[model samples]
Target: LGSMSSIAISYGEGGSVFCGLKSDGSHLVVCYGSNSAILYGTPGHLQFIGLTGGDGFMCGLLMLSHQPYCWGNSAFIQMGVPQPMTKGAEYLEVSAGDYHLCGLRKPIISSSLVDCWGYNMTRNFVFDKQLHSLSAGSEFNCALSSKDKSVFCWGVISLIPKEKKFQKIAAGGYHVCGILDGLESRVLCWGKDLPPKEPLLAVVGGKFYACGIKRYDHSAVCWGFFPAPTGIGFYDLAAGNYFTCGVLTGTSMSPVCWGLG
Candidate 1:
């Protein structure tokens, strides 16, 4: 928000991940591991919903009226028709990770709701009837609670707190993260079957690692399946399941991505 920092990086194909910034101005990302490729990005003025279609790594800004299309690791109808366009239109606010894509639309004066189109709930969210914040998880998806913290979910329902309030949230491949109003932090969530790790200042759940913000400084830290960079930090964090990224502050346009070999 008001600091200087660096987040994660892509280790090449050694990397199996993706990250994106949605229209909400918040960010999101996902990974498919060393074997799975993903696509994601902004889709116009929508919130944190991703898009579909592509291979290895696919992304965009928006995909509405303008073909509202997708393409990727090509193997399913989810990718849609035609192949990658050597040329295309300007897309925005989308998440094209794994076999799906997600997008969002923030209400003029309220929380946002996410809608997706991909392979079997690839970016699907279960309507718990809660107000959605931005994105979903698994494949180009995640979740966010309603303004009242009702509970809006996507993909599948694995974890839900019995008694906790979230203002902003997102899900990874199998884990979840969100802005915890009680502490102005994020929650490290696995399936409800497993207990949460710990709350964070800011957090992003990736395929393997759970990146978080700490000390209220927005500096990022990684846990599970990876090593922390010691000094690299972040302001805003995004991820799906394979990778993590951050918007570096203090620069005209400083943004960083990490998770390489």
Candidate 2:
């Protein structure tokens, strides 16, 4: 995967982060964000492949060794510099949520679990079973149980739903949504204002509203306390406090942002 090239990893209003690889796959430039887009070369930078940002920090997986690394605010103890997965397992993915971060670890047995550490979260929490996938929220996190596909959550107990099974799930600031495996793949949300029971491919909640991609047409749709936006095609979607960001389908896959910008 090393052809000696640079690629964009992730970005936000604050800035963006990039990674560069050498022919030998060593000492890659992990260029972070700023206003200017000017950069020369790497001196003693570590090669990273996967990158994601939280509200105040950034984390990435080393390209050469798959080790996880972080740099940014240590205020919330969010920058604990957590290591990679333990033996017989590997880091599958990482997600930075608000003041905390979590990653899914796949063991040799093909089962998975989440390791979360940041802002006095998850470091002492215990799981009763394995997980198929996990998503972090602002002050909470949830997961789809591999045993029964039911949703289990921790952190702010008030944000978690009852015993509901789902196919795909997403967690946001204070709400969670998932594609229910019912007679018709409908979306079910349980939080402050709640969203409609319409079918959605994916959904993510923000501070006051939730945005989702329509299951049939892939059109972007939002619902909640405020006025919802409609009529944009997106393959993937994410939400911030007052805005929603997503990627369009096909060719360019350009980014699209809407709401109170």
Candidate 3:
């Protein structure tokens, strides 16, 4: 099983709000944003292990139970939202898109599978392959195959690189990026725009921009439509439509955000 301590923050697809788990052992969620109307309804007093957000909603996995709990946008429920992962199902990781969300089902002994919910337009597709991790995009979902580390995508399939293996993958509005499976860990992108050929420790994609932690220095390197804040080392990162947030490297692990308001 994967540890949730690494992923402590997330941003909604619209960039209206961002959420993070408190590092003080509270496991409580805290959100910050300029838009007041969209900021108020986060669940209170509950402990969460993992968090993810979509266009107008946020979801978290309960710390002890590993069940998903979502809040924001009641309309999504009318459009076929998530049900309990069919009893005895625990999620390993979750990724949210513009109108949908997908989770990597933790395997008991077999290979993991990807499951989705919310808007039927892109959530109804079948996932037959054994995946290890997944990312949800505007209208598509991509996963890393556990068998070969190759990328497999469904829904609005675009031009994905062939015969290549990836160590990590992230999806944006219409683009996708992955860290190549090698010692260099260079980033390769396809869809809207290509990023610099820099070696990265990790990468996250926003609506029009993509940012990564440079392997050599750990500073942020971003490309596409927006610029990242300079001079801060990051431990983890997450992106929204117009902004990016990262956990600063240190004992505090506090979040710092940049980009358009």
Best by TM-score: 3
RMSD after CA superposition, every candidate: 8.1, 6.7, 4.0
Off by over 4 Å in 1: 1-57, 60-73, 77-97, 105-114, 122-130, 139-142, 183-186, 192-201, 249-257
Encode model 2's per-residue lDDT on 67-146: one tens digit a residue.
45666553553443473336444555555666676766654322445677777665634466776556666777777776
Best by lDDT: 3
Model 3, position 128, has a per-residue lDDT of 66
lDDT for each candidate structure: 0.43, 0.56, 0.68
- Cα TM-score of candidate 2: 0.70
What number of clashing residue pairs does each candidate have, in the order they appear?
A: 65, 0, 0
TM-score of each: 0.58, 0.70, 0.82
User: What is the C-alpha lDDT profile of model 1 across 89-142, one tens digit per residue?
Assistant: 232234443445554433242334444555664332334344434443454354
Query: So what's the TM-score on candidate 3?
Result: 0.82
**What is the RMSD of candidate 2?**
6.7
